[PDB]
Amino acid sequence: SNKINDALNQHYKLNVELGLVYAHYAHVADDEFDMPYLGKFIQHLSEDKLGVHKEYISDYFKRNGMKLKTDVSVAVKSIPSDAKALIQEVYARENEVRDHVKAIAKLALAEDDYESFYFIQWYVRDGLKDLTEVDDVVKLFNSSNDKLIIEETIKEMVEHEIWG
């Protein structure tokens, strides 16, 4: 089936682009907003987005017999004003990748291709896991106004059976 091929290629592309964008956001949050631990958090997100999230697609392509296509285009020319807008933008990106994964899963189940469904279950779980991990931090900036308190909270954060 070529529809699953196209959808998984789109997901590969999206994952690479998000990895690079998150890396840049982590750097700019460390260098300008004077919050190194928000930088470490977004850097861990970027590493997970550039590692297993695309290595698994490459491996599945090796295993079932599809063709891979590399095509990336990223140019970060705009950044938000403070840490709150930055973390809300990261949250929106996660909320979008959730819907993309849902669309791929529906397409796979409508093709009678149950190996691809069993494959995409991992993503329909990890999407919610990571969105929750990011929402836990976007909730912080609604709770206090001293930067160092939020810093220590995120520090102790970085220091389940269904989802986790």
Q: Which of helix, strand or coil describes residue 119? A: helix
Cβ proximity to a copy of itself: between 85 and 144 the closer is 144
Residue pair 49/19 in contact (Cβ under 8 Å)? The answer is: yes
Cβ proximity to a copy of itself: between 6 and 147 the closer is 147
Residue pair 155/37 in contact (Cβ under 8 Å)? The answer is: yes
Q: Which of helix, strand or coil describes residue 34? A: coil
Where on the phi/psi map is residue 42: left (φ > 0), alpha (ψ -120 to 50), or beta?
Answer: alpha
Using the rule CB under 8 A, is 20 a contact of a copy of itself?
Answer: yes
Structure tokens at 37: 């631990």
Using the rule CB under 5 A, is 17 a contact of Fe ion?
Answer: no
Using the rule CB under 8 A, is 89 a contact of a copy of itself?
Answer: no
Q: How far apart are CA 13 and CA 30, in angstroms?
A: 26
Using the rule CB under 8 A, is 16 a contact of a copy of itself?
Answer: yes
Local structure of residue 51 (DSSP, 8 states): T
Q: How far apart are CA 49 and CA 51, in angstroms?
A: 6
Binding test (CB under 5 A) with Fe ion, winner from 47, 48, 133, 151: 48
Binding-site string for a copy of itself from residue 48 to residue 77, where x marks contact by CB under 8 A and - marks none: --x-----x-xxxxxxx---x-xxxxxxx-
48 binds, among Fe ion, a copy of itself, none (CB under 5 to 8 A by kind): Fe ion
Cβ proximity to a copy of itself: between 2 and 145 the closer is 145
Structure tokens at 76: 């970060």
Binding site for a copy of itself (CB under 8 A): 16, 20-21, 23-24, 27-28, 30-31, 34, 50, 56, 58-64, 68, 70-76, 102, 105-106, 112, 114-115, 118-119, 121-122, 124-125, 128, 132, 139-140, 142-153, 160, 162-163
